[model samples]
Target chain A: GSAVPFHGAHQAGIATPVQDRLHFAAFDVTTEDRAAFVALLKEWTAAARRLTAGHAVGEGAYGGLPEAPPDDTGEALGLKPSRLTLTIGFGPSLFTRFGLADLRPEALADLPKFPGDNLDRARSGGDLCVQACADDPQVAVHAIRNLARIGFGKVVVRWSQLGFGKTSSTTPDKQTPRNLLGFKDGTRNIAGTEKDRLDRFVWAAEKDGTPWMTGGSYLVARRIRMHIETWDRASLQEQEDVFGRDKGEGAPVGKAKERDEPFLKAMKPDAHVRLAHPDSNGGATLLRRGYSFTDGTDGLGRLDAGLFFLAYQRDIRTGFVPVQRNLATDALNEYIQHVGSAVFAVPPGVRDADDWWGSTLFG
Target chain B: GSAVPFHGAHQAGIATPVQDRLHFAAFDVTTEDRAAFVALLKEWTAAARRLTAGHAVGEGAYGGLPEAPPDDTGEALGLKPSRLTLTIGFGPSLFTRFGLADLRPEALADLPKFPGDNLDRARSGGDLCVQACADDPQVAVHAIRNLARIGFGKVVVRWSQLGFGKTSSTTPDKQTPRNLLGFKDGTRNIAGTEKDRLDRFVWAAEKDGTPWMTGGSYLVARRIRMHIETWDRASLQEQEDVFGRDKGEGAPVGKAKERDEPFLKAMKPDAHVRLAHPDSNGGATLLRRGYSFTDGTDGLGRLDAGLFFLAYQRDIRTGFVPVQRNLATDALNEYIQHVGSAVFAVPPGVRDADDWWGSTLF
Candidate 1:
């Protein structure tokens, strides 16, 4: 894998083909000065460009002055760009600072609590979030580490996650990836090349009041913890009934092929796929790009593993919220719970070399 | 990244070219029945053969009896073998329970504590352990997870570790990998092709007391945590002084290239490389195959990252213990700590379809 274009009308990570590895981090801002924050933003953009283009940050990892640490941490010294994409987002809390209350879009509101939500305060919300997707785990880790290092006193990591394998894909032509539960996920996801759907369902429209989010999108991130031990113990018939798809072929009920259209009525009322389908939830669709994670063993013998769910859409209320609310009655809810949640307003991407992240709003 | 032949004169992993990912698990046997414990060994052996050959355990993860969990986990369904190798070892504690105490090798004695040791009991020792390695991280993880699943009732995991990158290589022709400290490690490591050295230092010989460990070596595992934050803040000069090698070139103090010979006298008195060299430790050498690891954050605003140090040798007393004892004055000890440690007696590899892990003894 090689570099993806850093400068685009919309951010690269959401629409770009999902990478194999993900190092997503949420930050808490420590500085009160708007100038200092904006300056670091520009600095971060400059560094992100060079890093995405397969170059070191500044004077390289080992060739700088002897008295100070090298500009780049050398762990990624011999790594490829790996199609890395560093995307920045401003959360609802970020709008409270810098006298930027008017710039907060109504769509960037905090996500509503569902029936099974058991969110952790420390891991839930952040002032800013950066989603770093790459083909190489080391590359993604290095980019996040260096960016956090550059922000020294201005920002500190609130919580971060590392995902090993992608669970969802924007490129539907490829083989559908599997979640930790051993079933293919995101079989009906919107393709990256679908311009019409992207415009109508994914990209935010130009607003008279919040013009900074014109070409951007709203993001909903949920750290869904799957009860894998329980799921694994269930019989094949029971497992197939909950997912509304066969474990082997991932075919919907009454279908021979995986891509065949699902007849919602033929499925059980509380089946997971049937409840979250567009036909069932007022035509709600999500461009999902999630990944699977295995943190370690739980205090017991079980694996602390699940999916880190990521979705982008034009509006949260019409997209993730409505669809998630419908999932309250789904049978699959018994085997998974939402433990951490956050909402971010991804702004329009950098347009040129001089353009920086959130320049439209900060300017 | 192809299947490594599982059946060999000696185990495949010890001298095999190191893979990129590692999932090492230490298991505690739950059953006190000797026959039951040996039965699981045969079961584990069969599964290891199938898995290392890119096949599923029994009926695969799916297509099995619907009433029971699948014999194989399906996560590695489409993955390549990626040269996966599962090397098992018997710890010193195993002989005490199995009525094989007389067969216990003297070389498998418990490791002695070094000066700066801060060991954690939970992660320190086990009755048995398996080191699963592969080129793909998922594949390695899957191999370990499935084996653990197969041993559900017979054994339980005491502690497990996952390492992302190989810090040492058996194949020296490839680019030398770096440790978490961003310095090239194992530059002078003994290569896999060194048959003479392997026989001389790496393999154990048959003694009068222990015949089961004739062709196998001893294994020493240590979880060494590096103080990366403090190391990262040090001056370049101080960093170089600790390792006794330049950061970028990885050359000796007086040499211009990485592979150049080191003149021990020209280095600092407490330099790591100098003190740990064979000349300083009575010709003691270890066949090191370690890996770099990062287990999330330390919760104190720093990375909990370090090296999972693995070494194989004829005896721990000669290979690891003496050299470690000589390192009491080493400068690198200030920035690193040995948090977990274990010593195991690796038995000879299974010879054929009928041969199992401990068939030679049991």
Candidate 2:
């Protein structure tokens, strides 16, 4: 997690008054209107400090829709506002952790269930991501009516990548096609002539919490919903046995050394096995960067693909939850569905030089 | 336009079927060919024929991504290769009707340019809203390799509004507040009654097409970025006396008495002076929907905000193209840059009980 600084370059951290991360999540409601749903989360943190951190509606600070300074001819004229991502799912028994509390009851027990779109199975909180924005659809419906007045079980609002200006530097063209489907994506992937494949995806130890966390990093914003026309009608030897590689030059299948190929030493006894096979969890790893969405047409003609999956870890259980719990249940979980999940602490290691991180354990 | 009867509701002239809208535009490359440029746009559109006509990319459809559908999810989910929205613009000239062909140019003399994020007037479209799903990255970068071998021409892939799951008949707590910031909003603007405010923005009149073509429905996807900090910190009474209603809540500002609003008889000695005054082609009379983005971020702390204005009409006086001709020197001119605008049409009305004017015509 160190190279991504170029564009006039400088080094080190912090840019004063620098803390802009406005995220909101909400789900199915009327949870017996708790104080009219906590005064509508206090009139939306007081309309997010009146619009973007000038703070005054009921005072705690969340306003800045425009006291002025975010329309450089709408970011130099790409005519901004094109982000729409909608997700809804919940119930793996509400995700439990096996660590019994009367058999754990629910953490999101195993996680992933979709029913009458949640009319109340005893209220919600479970979620991973919900980033809404507007160029008007009425301020993305009042930002999803104040994220579902504030409980957020499972919700997905459309329109995305609300990032522009001041968020770049994950280079190697953003670290080699950043992987994450089930394997053989640049394999344990890294090169500029591997110093040990960039020392096992980087960070050599001492991880307390920011020396800028050292050239610093951490960003994972998963929405992950791909059934991709049921894995595009399956067959290129079933897409090289569901990603053990070599559908034709993607290599790996029974490796007769086609350029040092090592998808778990290229195995092939009719591949496509369960739980990421090549020695299970399909050889586990994470470096992924995602963006592939389609929220149009559900009038039953089908085809709403996914993967807004982003990743960059030194540890989220040895990078991306033991490679998504070793590809969760991989022949691609019978055509994919993780609905949405998030994990962000990401701050440390900025250049063009610093202002923010030395780290006193920030959020 | 005929394919959304997958079951019930949304019915309006009905006929929704248009696929092949492969719009891509990417600038800034290098990162070892972004996974062989997303496995060469996924083995060249999965070696063709993912199927169309009642479209089917696979797996219990509707927002279910683990990967595979759109045309089979290329093996184990690994399809990451994005960034492509190229455009070209110059225009038939005094900046071609002011919406500035989405701006970013340097060597112009005559019009029509779209596809932007420049690298020396660079234009090669391949990225922006991709939906082919062999696990899409804009269908692995223009259907296949080094810009589809070269020629979708500088690049322009068309046929839009992919994977139609449509359903938004209002509710996630009753929807309608579309903002990137400007403002007109709705509860069903104007007309509390007097036979429904007789015209409140009146539009629909076409024995099919004619009458200047009445109010020219559209081809407009027009965008021209600028919001350099909320139109430069508001105040002309929060930028031209805040509106309060013209679109609804009974037409305020001295309510030249349109039947309801008496906000101060509609708003006093010049409602922000006939809306941002300065006539000669600079202000007043509404209608505009937008898009025109640039992530370049000028000096680099860039949130370069967007939308330059996308107005339409068939009669706000033969249509909204004449508000004493946009008051002069303006369409919101350069920075608040006339922030967020809207006007919805091109076959959008049919139900929520008929009205974008009785669903465009019938």
> Which structure among the candidates has the greatest TM-score?
1
lDDT of 2 by residue, A1-363 (tens): 311121111111111111111122323232343344334433433343232221122321112242432211111111222222221222222123222123211111232343212222211233222334322222233333333323333223222332111111212333223222322343333333433533455332335333323433344455555554445455445555666655324545556543544565454443443334325543444454343444322333233445555555444545555555555435655756665554433333322222222121221
Task: DockQ for candidate 2, please give it.
Answer: 0.05
Worst 10 residues of 2 chain B by lDDT: B163-172
In model 1, pairs of residues that clash are none
- Give per-residue CA lDDT, model 1, range B1-362, as digits (tens): 57899987789899999887788989888898999888899999999988998787877878766677777657776666788999999888888887888888888868876888999998889999999988776677777777887788888888888876788978878888877677888887779899989888889877625677888989999999988777777777777888889888889987899889888888899999998998898888889999887776676655567899999999888899898888999999989999999989888889999999988878
Which regions of candidate 2 deviate over 4 angstroms? A1-242, A245-309, A312-363, B1-54, B57-155, B158-178, B182-216, B219-221, B230-232, B240-296, B308-312, B315-317, B329-362
Candidate 1's C-alpha runs over 4 A off are A166-173, B65-68
- What is the TM-score of each predicted model, taking all chains together? 0.96, 0.38
Provide the DockQ value for model 1.
Answer: 0.44
User: What does DockQ give for each predicted structure?
Assistant: 0.44, 0.05
